[PDB]
Amino acid sequence: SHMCDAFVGTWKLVSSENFDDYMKEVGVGFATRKVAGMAKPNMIISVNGDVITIKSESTFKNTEISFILGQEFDEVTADDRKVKSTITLDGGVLVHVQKWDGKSTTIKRKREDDKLVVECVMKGVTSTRVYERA
């Protein structure tokens, strides 16, 4: 419903900040942290009706989620967590909460200028991933 018009398309990762400390906070093990930290994924976003699809294409992994805003779904993350995810819109920001093993992390996706900025927070620790159009 014109839901994500400014986000639809293909985006390539151009910069990352604080990746390692965020992944440590999440509980990701050494080898996965090191290998995952090299990746420069593309993020492919599309919308069909009420269904939003976000794919990540990478040398580390490929992942895909499809969802309806507000409606919880199962997600196996790139680091192999089995989480319950709920994604909503808050003032133009896509807010994605992942719950697993009594833990929680929040991933926010927004547009700033010609960038797509992703901010992920686990307790006090934030990582920022900046994407540009591919």
Ligand X SMILES: *Sc1ccccc1C(N)=O
Q: Which residues belong to the annotated binding site for a fatty acid?
A: 129-131
Q: Report the alpha-carbon distance of residue 25 to residue 89 in Å, rounded.
A: 25
The set of residues, in sequence order, having a beta carbon less than 8 Å from that of 117 and lying 6+ positions away, is: 109, 110, 111, 128, 129, 130, 131
Looking at the Cβ atoms of 37 and 72, the one nearer to ligand X is 37
Binding-site member from 9, 10, 12, 19 for ligand X (CB under 6 A): 19
Q: What is the 3-state secondary structure (H, E, C) of 19-33?
A: HHHHHHHHCCCHHHH
Q: Is 11 in the site for ligand X (CB under 6 A)?
A: no
Q: Report the alpha-carbon distance of residue 36 to residue 19 in Å, rounded.
A: 10
| Nearest partner of 24 among 87, 84, 103, judged by Cα | 103
Q: Is 45 in the site for ligand X (CB under 6 A)?
A: yes
String of contacts with ligand X for each residue 97-126, x by CB under 6 A: ----------x-xx-------x-x------
Q: Is 61 in the site for ligand X (CB under 6 A)?
A: no
Q: Is 51 in the site for ligand X (CB under 6 A)?
A: no
Minimum CB–partner distance for residue 110 and ligand X (Å): 5
Q: Report the alpha-carbon distance of residue 134 to residue 9 in Å, rounded.
A: 8
What are the residues binding ligand X (CB under 6 A)?
A: 3-4, 7, 19, 22-23, 45, 52, 89, 92-94, 107, 109-110, 118, 120, 127, 129
